[PDB]
Amino acid sequence: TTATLTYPFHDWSQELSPRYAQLRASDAPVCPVVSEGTGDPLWLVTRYATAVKLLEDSRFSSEAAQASGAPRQEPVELRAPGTRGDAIAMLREAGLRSVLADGLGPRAVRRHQGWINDLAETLMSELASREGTFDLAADFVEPLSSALVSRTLLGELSADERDLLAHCADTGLRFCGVTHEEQVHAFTQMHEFFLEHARRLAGTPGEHLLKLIAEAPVDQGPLSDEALAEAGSLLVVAGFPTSSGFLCGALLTLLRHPDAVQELHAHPERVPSAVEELLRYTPLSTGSVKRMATEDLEIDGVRIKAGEVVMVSLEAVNHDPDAFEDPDVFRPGREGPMHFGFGRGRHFCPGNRLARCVIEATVRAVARRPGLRLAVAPEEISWHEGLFFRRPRAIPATW
Ligand X SMILES: O=C1N[C@@H](Cc2c[nH]c3ccccc23)C(=O)N2CCC[C@@H]12
The residue range among 20-28, 71-79, 113-121, 350-358 that interacts with ligand X, by the rule CB under 6 A, is: 71-79
- The DSSP line for 299-337 is ETTEEE-TT-EEEE-HHHHHT-TTTSSSTTS--TT---S
Q: Which residue is nearest to ligand HEM (CB)?
A: 351
Which amino acid does the sequence have at 51? A
For ligand HEM, which is the closer residue by CB, 223 or 234? Answer: 234
- C-alpha separations of 308 from 20, 75, 145, 345 in Å: 21, 17, 36, 20
| Binding at 235: pick from ligand X, ligand HEM, none (beta carbon under 5-8 Å per type) | ligand HEM
Residue of the chain from 145, 183, 242, 362 that contacts ligand X (CB under 6 A): 242
For ligand HEM, which is the closer residue by CB, 307 or 350? Answer: 350
> Does residue 285 touch ligand X according to CB under 6 A?
yes
Which amino acid does the sequence have at 4? T
For ligand HEM, which is the closer residue by CB, 178 or 235? Answer: 235
Strands 6-7 and 31-35: parallel
Return the beta strands (E) in the chain as ranges. Answer: 6-7, 31-35, 41-45, 60-61, 134-135, 289-293, 297-299, 302-304, 309-312, 373-374, 396-398
The residue range among 139-147, 176-184, 286-294, 324-332 that interacts with ligand X, by the rule CB under 6 A, is: 286-294
Number of residues in contact with ligand HEM under rule CB under 6 A? 22
The two counts, helices (H) then strands (E), for the chain are 16, 11
- Taking the complex as a whole, how short is the minimal distance between the CB of residue 286 and ligand X, in angstroms? 6
For ligand HEM, which is the closer residue by CB, 142 or 178? Answer: 142
- With CA atoms as reference, report the closest residue to 268 among 363, 347, 337, 357: 363
- With CA atoms as reference, report the closest residue to 224 among 84, 397, 370, 30: 84
What are residue 293's DSSP bridge partners? 60
The residue range among 112-120, 234-242, 264-272, 376-384 that interacts with ligand X, by the rule CB under 6 A, is: 234-242
- Taking the complex as a whole, how short is the minimal distance between the CB of residue 251 and ligand HEM, in angstroms? 12
> Does residue 54 touch ligand X according to CB under 6 A?
no
> Does residue 281 touch ligand HEM according to CB under 6 A?
no
C-beta neighbour count of 335 within 10 angstroms: 6
> Does residue 317 touch ligand X according to CB under 6 A?
no
Interacting residues with ligand HEM (CB under 6 A): 62, 88, 104, 234-235, 238-239, 242-243, 246, 284, 289, 314, 341-343, 347, 349-351, 354-355
